[PDB]
Every structure is written in C-alpha cells, then in structure tokens.
Design an enzyme around this catalytic site. Structure first.
Site, short mmCIF file in Angstrom:
data_model
loop_
_atom_site.label_atom_id
_atom_site.label_comp_id
_atom_site.label_asym_id
_atom_site.label_seq_id
_atom_site.Cartn_x
_atom_site.Cartn_y
_atom_site.Cartn_z
N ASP A 56 0.82 -1.21 0.00
CA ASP A 56 0.00 0.00 0.00
C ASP A 56 0.87 1.28 0.00
O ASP A 56 0.58 2.24 -0.72
CB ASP A 56 -0.99 -0.05 1.17
CG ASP A 56 -2.09 -1.10 0.96
OD1 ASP A 56 -2.57 -1.66 1.97
OD2 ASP A 56 -2.53 -1.42 -0.16
N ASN B 143 -10.66 -1.41 -0.94
CA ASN B 143 -11.51 -1.92 0.13
C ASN B 143 -11.01 -1.62 1.55
O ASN B 143 -11.82 -1.58 2.48
CB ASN B 143 -11.69 -3.44 -0.01
CG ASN B 143 -10.40 -4.18 -0.02
OD1 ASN B 143 -9.56 -3.98 -0.91
ND2 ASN B 143 -10.20 -5.03 0.98
N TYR B 144 -9.70 -1.41 1.70
CA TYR B 144 -9.08 -1.22 3.02
C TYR B 144 -9.08 0.24 3.44
O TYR B 144 -8.97 1.13 2.61
CB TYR B 144 -7.59 -1.53 3.12
#
Ligand SMILES: [Cu+2]
Ligand SMILES: [Cu+2]
Ligand code: NA
Ligand code: NA
Lengths: 620, 620
Positions: free
Chosen positions: B290, B373-374
C-alpha cells in the site's frame, strides 16, 4: 431479588449474629475472610439461599474454622476445624501488620542489629511480609510473618528510599515471639529521599496542562438496577465484589436481537503473585500472593472523582466484614463509566460513493488496591463489538534493597546505593465460560505455514489448525507467539447461520511465565504461573488456582490437583484459567514513584454473531 | 524558517515550473511521486536548500525519469532515465485505476467470461490491482495491472459482496492492451447484499447511546508554530507529510530541565504489505504494498470533526502534487489532539500517610487512508512519561472471493457462498534513532533463567543478558516472546547520573512475521517482513525496506542489499527497522464492514532520565 446482588451491611451483621448465636464467634475469634457464595448450578428455579463462607481465626492459639452460614435461614450449614500445617494458614489479618515492628522493637537481637547501623528504633518501619514455606521446621503449623526494615527520617518520609539490607527477622504473630533474627552484615542505608511531593525533588510544578473536560449532558448510557446489575449497549452483567478477588463479573451476556446470549458465567482474577528474583537470603523467600495471602479486595481504595476516575462516574460502595464481623463500607470503591474508544469502523468506497464512519466506546468497571508499596488497578472493559478485555495497571513504589558494590545480576540501581530486586507480577484470570450456555469446549489454534510445491506453486499459501482439548490431562498449554497461538472457546451444540459452532477467541500478550527453577518452593506453590492456559471441568470447590489457603501452604492443592481428575472438557461446563504477567527489571524512571505499566488479555467473538453486531450503531 | 516545514502549494507549483522550464514536464509527462527531501546531516549551519524528489512517468511509452529539484535555487540538481525492467516500475497512478475496467469492457475474452456468468458488463467493477513479479516474461519492463471483478447491483451497492471468482485479467495500462484473460471456471456470484447503511440489514438504529462531550475550555496544551512544529508537555517535534509514507515525525526530542534531548531523528512507516494466502491462481499473485506501490499519503481522508477525530482538534492540511504538478490540498488530512490516558502514577502510603494520584495524557498525531476496500488509521502517541507509541487501526471491507463448496484451508466463509481469503497486513517502521544525539547502538535483551544450585539455593533467581549488535551482518533479529526479548537503543557516550548509558527500549507485540514460503516471490520482494528487527548504518539513499521502486520489482534492492555492506553500527548513526503485522483469518463479525483491529509497538525510556520525568505533573 437477584441472588448475585452485593452483600449488604445487614447481611454481614446477620452472619455475625448467626455465628455468635452458634458459639463460633466469641471474644477470641477474628474473621480472616468473609464472602458470599455464588448460587449453585440450576438454583434459579428454587428460592434465594444467600450463603456466606467465613474463615475464623482464634487469637488464643486454638485451631481456626471454616464455616458456611445461610443468612437467609439464620443457620450454620457447616463448621470444620482446620489443621493449618496440612491445609494452610488463614489469610494475613489487617491487625497483624503492626505486630512485626512492635515485637521487634523490644527484641535484643533486632536492637543490636539496628545499633550496628546507628539507626534509631523509633524511625525503623518493618514491613509485615508473607513467609511462604522454606527449610524452617518450627514454622510448620505456626502463623509467621517475616520483617524487612526501612528507615523513615520523619513522619511524612517515604521509607522505601531507605532499605536496611543484610537484615531480616521472623515472628510468630500468635504467640507474639521473635523466632529468628538474621544479620548477614551491614550495608549502607541509602540516604537520598524519595519524597515525590517535596518541591526540592519535583521542582516547580508544570503550569502547561490545560483542562480536559469529559461530560455526559444526558447522563450515562448504562443503567444500574438491583444495586449491581448493569445494562449497556446490548451487554448485561452483575458486578460482584469479594474481599479476596476484588471485583468479580457474573452473568456476562449479550442481547442479540431478542435473545440474551450468555458468554461468561464468572470472570475474576483468582490469584496474583509477585515472585522476587534476588538470591540474597534477605529476600530469596519473597513471594507475595496479593490475592490469596493478603486479600486485594480488603485494601481497595476509596476513589476520588475527577482524579482516580474521570468523566460521568457511577460508583459502587461494597461492604466487607472487619475482624469482628461488623460491616465496613469501602466508599466509592468501584468505578463504572463509559468512554469513547476512537473509530469503530470506517470505509470510504470509490464505487458506491458512500463514506461511513462510526465511533467505538467501552464500558469500564474498575477498582484500585494498595498492598504495602504496590498499588494495582484492575480494569474490565466491554466493547460495542463484543470484545471483552481485562487490564491490570501496576504502579506504587518499587520494593527496594541496597545496590551492591560492584553491581548485581539480580538487582537494578535506582539512586546512589539504592537497588530494586528483579521480580514478576503474575495474574491468573479464572473465566468460568458459558458460550451460548454451559456446553463448551476449547481449541488451541495455531497458524500453519505451507511449503511451496504442488497445490501451492507460488509459495504463498498459509493456513491454521485447531486442536480440541478433550480432557483435563491435555489442557495445560503454553504460549507460542511465533505461530500466533490463541485459544477458542466454542459451544459445539450452538451453530451460527453458516453452520459453524459459535465461539470466542482468547488473545494473550504472550509475556514470560514464572521464571523460577521448576524445583523451587514458588514453582510448586504458584504452579499455575508456570503455564499460560489451563482448562478444568467446573466444580463448586475449585475456586482459586492456589487453593483456599495459600499462606504458608506448600504444594498439594490448586490447579495441579484439580486436573489430575482428568475429567471430560469436550462439550461440558468448563473453566479457563489464563496466566499473564509483567516481568520487571526496574529502571531509574520507576523511582521514586512508578509510572503505570500494564498487562492483560482479551476475548473477541469468533463466529459468535451472524455478521457484525454493530451495524445498528448510529452516526455521530 | 524551519527546513522541516510542510511543502506549500507555492513550492509544488515552483517544482512544476522548474521542471517545465528545464524541458522535463511536457504534455505527455505525469508526476507519479513528488516529495520534499530531508536536509542533509550537518546542514543546519548552512542556509536552507529545499529540495524535492520527483518520479516522472511518460504516457507515450518513453522511459520515466527520477529528478531532484532545488526549489530554493530554481534548478534541476539531477535527472536520470530509469530502466524499469531493472530498477522497478513507478508507483501506480491515480488515473490508471479506471483504466483496467474500461479496457476490459470492450475485450471479447472478458465479455465472454461475463456472459458465461450472466453478468451485465455495465454492472461489473474491476479493481486495479498491483501485479507483482511472477512467470509472465512479457510483463518485464511493462506497466501492468491485474483486474478482479465485483458486481455492483446499483450505484450505491457494495460490490465487495459480489466477487466474481474464477476470473482474472492482466492489462498493459500504457499501450492500453489486455494481455491475458484467465477463466478457470464459473463460481456462483454471492447474492446477499453487504450494504451497511441499508435499514433492512442494520435494523432500527440504536437510540441508547447518550452523548459524550470532550472539550478543552482553555484550548489545547500543545502549541503549533511554523506550520508543523509541535511543543507539548516537554516534547518537541515536527510533523511532516509525504505522499508515500504519510505522516512522518522529525526531530522527536524531550526537554529535560534546560536541555533539549534528541530521541528519534525520523519516524515513519516506510512500507506496508498485504500478502494473500489463497493458492487459487485467481489470487495467488496478490500482495498489496500500500505504501510502496499505491502511496498511502495520496489517499489520506479529509477527517470530519466530532466524527473521525473527537475533542479539541488542531488539523494540518498537507499539500501534494497531482499528476500534472499542480498543488492539491488534503483538507483536514492530519489530526492533532491531546487526550486523557487514565492514571499515570498512584500510591497510598501506610507509613507516611500520603495519598498521591496523578493523571496521564498523550499527544495524538494521526491520519486515515483508503486503499480500495481497506482503510487504515496511522496513530503516533507521545506520553507524559517519555513513552513513544505507534498504532495502526485496520478497518474497511474485507477483500472477498467465492467460498468453495466443501470448504477451504485458505479462505473463511462470511455469508452464503461468500469467502474471505486469509492474508496478513505487515508494516515496517523506520526509526532513524538519535538517543541523546546520533552516536547510538542496539542491544538485544533476553530474560535469563537460572538453575537452582550454589549461589541460588532456593531456585528463585532470574536475570537478563544484553548482546550488542556490532555490525549490520549481526543485526537481523527475530522475536522471542518466551524470553521477553526486547531491543535497547542507547548512546554509549551519554551516561545518566548512575553512570549507565542512556537508552530507550523497544517493546514489540511479537505477532507472526511473513508466513509465505522463503522461496516465494513475496518473500524476496518483502524480505524485510521475514524478520522482526533490522539495524542499518544511516545512509541518505536507504529510505524504504523495499527500495525506491517496488511496483513489479523483483528482489535486489532494499534491506537485504543495505546490510550486505556490513557496516559498523556500534556507536554510530543508525536506523532501526521494525516489522510488525496482523495475521487475519476473517471472521463472520468482519462482514459486511470490519470493526477496527490494531497492531503496533512502543519505546519506553530505559535509564534515559535520572529519575521519573513526571514528578512535576500537578494534581487534579
Ligand atoms: Cu514491579
Ligand atoms: Cu485483514
Ligand atoms: Na463454564
Ligand atoms: Na540515527
């Protein structure tokens, strides 16, 4: 109406009266322990029988008794004379704490030791310390306390700054005799003061802290009914209090839709021990079972508002017995409040355009106790999402010694000449489980690494395994942090909507367990502390991991004896006993008063619910 | 005046102008990364040179460049063409996220796959997912994203409820070609919705939560000067922000009496990776860096008052570059506040009669980011007592798949037919240490058990050992929770009043590290994640544990390459890199939106101070 209500002043005076009437509480008798018994299994159908258990000491040297009284019926149910050499001495009495110093003050050996160090006897405080069980045959069957000395330069001085090393004494507190005085040689008594309210040491107090105000303009979101029944954000429980264990939670349950679902039947800290790791003969016998020997509930502090407990606080004021059976209130001894706990759930979705944020909160139930130099906060937390947590906060003043010239492998230096022996603080949480009712089992869950090869060609797969603990002989378990080991308590007869047994997962901190050699006295007396997790079949007389009488009691009782029964725990009424502790190598920053350090555990739902239980939490 | 101030909109537009003037930012150029460089060591004596580092992508297929600009002097310092097949592709561009779905929507193979499943192409969302490095030779030197499909029944539907398993596609986002479409067979697309704002799923919202009000009637106890310099309760620091790392703390120091004592020169989360443990070919390539691939700072949320951040909040609004070099403000992207943190220290002394209680507080510096989604919250905490802590809060919607008929060893069931592949979230904290200045060393400290025998006749003694890590080859360390392993960073030339080197102790959570087989692609690309602690000698170009270019980059760079230099770290300018993560076996309670879970670490003073640093905290 609740059989789980706190003991009232009236009930305690009634126990006193029943005992008196029965001939069991004459002028030489002293109450060393008094507490209400939990209702028997399946007793909700029958009418209330409030029963109290009492340990009665006799100051004239007669054998003590264990007594059970029905306060409802005004009767003695049972009374039995104890042989303390076999089953253990009664807990230390509040009134015995002054006795060690008082007897020592006119003992010629003690006075000679103080004179060799040029110490004024009027200035020497003596800590009344539990004795344990070592090589001294004459102590067997006798109530002994050991004394370590600390100098107090003036009435408001912190004596802990001035340990008198090389000197220890043993005293029979019933016959009022000094049995031994041991002087291994003089050590310098550390001279610097440790007075954390003296402006000379603190310096000018900070003027930089601006107020933080926490209020609830509409009041708290929890209700209290029947004195001690809490309802908060779907949770239901009863807050008990016992003079040994302190705050005890009963009937922890969660309202899921229309159904009140049990989770834990009883949660307590059933023991705590502080073993010292200094091999000097002055302290090598030191192990304080604060719960079992001293009774932590008895020393619960009265907690002041905006100070010990901040926010909109609801207090309970539990009642205990004094040594004569009169009720004594601990005013504001239990704090209850809810607090904000940051973000609960959050997602900003690119595709839907929906941004969602919800806040968490927790219900807090706590007390703070003081045992000599130590002060401990015991905190239970219930969270919106179903998580249950315990946290111990350790503070107070570190137990001191001299710091040896040339250093030490077992003591750290705090100030010039001032040492702090290494030690642990180890707790046992007793969790009488009731996951969706009493038919429960425990599995140990480990992460499972997988090898690159057929079925896993990229070498990315990983998994987990669960091992059911089927019988007590297989249920003494150790931590394995490297493999992410946890323990799941499930109900094999209660399944969620996905056809999986409902459960809760216990997450430990995986701190070191008892460090002492396995052949030591403390490894036997605190056997529970050698392993992280024990599972037993429930029995009404298996209350403490160390047995009922810990003081001067060898091995023979407690958890090792319970699990020898090798009972079925695979879909039965079971109890989890989790050992967790702090290993303390004191630092200079711990002196002259220790900043809080913490340890604990939590349990999180694991397929207990059919989806998140906090979808109905409102925005803002 | 501070060289550590946040980038201003003006500085970013000036970088744009300098690049334009120099011929480096024509109409086909895109900024994939832009950030300010930290000042060089010893640069405080010289005047300010604000330098910015930029990664420039070219949409026409030309080679990208790495460029350093002096915005102070209006010059290009250096510009170098990158060979991406060797050194790695640039970070994923915001503008590429729509491209995967768009290209796939007119691809005949993709359309055939959707038609086999009776899915309307207009309703199929495609996640633009990093590709990593596997067996596909044609991807080497090409910018590839892989696409996994999720059905959205209507504009506000949560697509995550409806994964399309058995199907994955690979796309060249520069040439705008679909390279592969893989269809392993149809799986049922889970039908239940996951709409956590739909009243049908939430039910009636709770009306039981009463307000909690947290105010500071006199304002906060911290000051902010020069935009981002914080002073709070003896602490001093500068709050930076970088589009890759997010919030970065600089110059963490503590005012002890008259002296400002450095502790940490720079603290950041320098990488985070989410490796998946499902061996299905549909997801076995899935590992989201990320930080390194997506740039977490870029996706920082605007945080709303009384909602994301509660209390008296001071916000920073960091400025970043868009793809063309224009400044873009992230309004209220960083929250700063202080909060009460329970009891700091407490003792009620029997002998002195003095009862003492003090409250703790912490300064909180945080941001929240969203990556598909996170959603992750990154929290840094400074405490009154000198403790420094980081906490990551993980929430969002779990990444889904089909749940296979007959179950899975690598996927859990969330709802009928709905699976959640097992995965980890693993962080690397880069702590450029400066304990009382830059001359530092690290010791590994283990508890030492001792055998009953001569010198330890009662079997109670225990101790500890410290091992200095002298060179980088010896400084790759693993956790050992059972022995209470920690790591102490000390300054061997700076001693406390007791003649001991001052230090700070790092306390890890000892969660599992990277689980993947050591021969996997992810074990090589995220080598840092295989060990808990690394120590390097400081170098200005050793910024990330994965190197500068992570996207589609094999092993060869990052921490394994840094430590091969085997440099002296015993009393030198060193950097600690701590790996910590969550291993996630999703539970039904995580669906349809996940309650926060946490992981982190802290550092506590260890003989840094000459006594407790909080003696001057006032009562109440
Ligand atoms: Cu301690
Ligand atoms: Cu996860
Ligand atoms: Na049970
Ligand atoms: Na450094």
């Amino acid at each position: 109406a609740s059989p789980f209500r706190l003991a009232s002043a009236g009930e305690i005076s009634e126990v006193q009266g029943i005992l008196r009437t029965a001939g069991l509480l004459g002028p030489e008798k002293r109450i060393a322990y008094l507490g209400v018994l939990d209702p028997a299994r399946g007793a909700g159908s029958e009418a209330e029988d409030r029963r109290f258990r009492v340990f009665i000491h006799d100051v004239s040297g007669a054998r003590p008794q264990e007594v059970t009284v029905s306060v409802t019926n005004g009767t003695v149910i049972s009374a039995v004379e104890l042989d303390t050499a076999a089953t253990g001495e009664l807990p230390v009495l509040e009134e015995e704490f002054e006795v060690v110093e008082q007897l020592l003050a006119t003992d010629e050996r003690w006075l000679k030791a103080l004179a060799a160090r040029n110490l004024d006897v009027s200035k020497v405080r003596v800590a009344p310390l539990s004795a344990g069980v070592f090589e001294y045959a004459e102590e067997r069957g006798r109530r002994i306390l050991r004394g370590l000395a600390f100098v107090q330069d003036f009435p408001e001085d912190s004596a802990w700054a001035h340990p008198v090393d090389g000197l220890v004494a043993y005293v029979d507190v019933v016959s009022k005799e000094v049995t031994r005085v041991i002087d291994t040689g003089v050590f310098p008594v550390p001279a610097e003061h440790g007075n954390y309210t003296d402006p000379e040491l603190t310096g000018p107090l900070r003027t930089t802290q601006k107020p933080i105000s926490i209020t609830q303009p509409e009041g708290p979101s929890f209700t209290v009914t029947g004195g001690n029944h809490i309802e908060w954000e779907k949770w239901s429980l009863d807050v008990g209090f016992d003079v040994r264990e302190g705050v005890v939670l009963h009937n922890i349950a969660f309202r899921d839709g229309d159904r009140l679902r049990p989770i834990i039947n009883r949660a307590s800290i059933a023991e705590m021990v502080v073993p010292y790791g200094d091999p000097s003969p002055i302290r090598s016998w030191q192990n304080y079972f604060d719960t079992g020997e001293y009774l932590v509930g008895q020393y619960a502090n009265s907690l002041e508002l905006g100070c010990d407990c901040l926010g909109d606080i609801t207090y309970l004021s539990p009642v205990i017995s004094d040594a004569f059976g009169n009720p004594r209130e601990i005013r504001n001894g239990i704090c209850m409040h809810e607090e904000d706990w940051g973000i609960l759930a959050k997602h900003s979705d690119l595709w839907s355009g929906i941004n969602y944020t919800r806040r968490n909160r927790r219900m807090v139930i706590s007390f703070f106790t003081t045992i000599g130099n130590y002060d401990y906060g015991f905190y239970w937390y219930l969270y919106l999402d179903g998580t249950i947590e315990f946290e111990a906060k350790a503070t107070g003043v570190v137990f001191t010694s001299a710091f040896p010239e040339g250093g030490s492998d077992n003591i750290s230096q705090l100030a010039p000449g001032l040492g702090a022996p290494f030690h642990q603080h180890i707790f046992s949480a007793r969790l009488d489980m009731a996951i969706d009712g009493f038919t429960n089992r425990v599995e140990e869950e480990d992460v499972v690494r997988q090898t690159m090869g057929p079925g896993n060609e990229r070498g990315n797969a990983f998994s987990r395994k669960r091992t059911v603990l089927t019988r007590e002989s297989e249920a003494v378990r150790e931590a394995d942090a490297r493999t992410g080991r946890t323990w799941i308590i499930s109900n094999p007869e209660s399944k969620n909507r996905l056809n999986e047994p409902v459960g809760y997962k216990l997450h430990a901190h995986n701190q070191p367990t008892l460090l002492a050699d396995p052949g030591s006295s403390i490894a036997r007396r605190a056997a529970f502390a050698t392993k992280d997790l024990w599972v037993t079949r429930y029995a009404d007389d298996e209350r403490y991991p160390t047995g009922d009488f810990v003081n001067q009691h060898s091995g023979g009782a407690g958890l090792p004896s319970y699990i020898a029964q090798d009972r079925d725990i695979d879909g039965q009424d079971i109890v989890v006993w989790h050992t967790f502790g702090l290993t303390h190598f004191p630092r200079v920053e711990d002196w002259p008063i220790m900043p809080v350090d913490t340890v604990g555990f939590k349990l999180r739902p694991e397929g207990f619910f059919d989806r998140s239980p906090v979808l109905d939490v409102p925005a803002n």
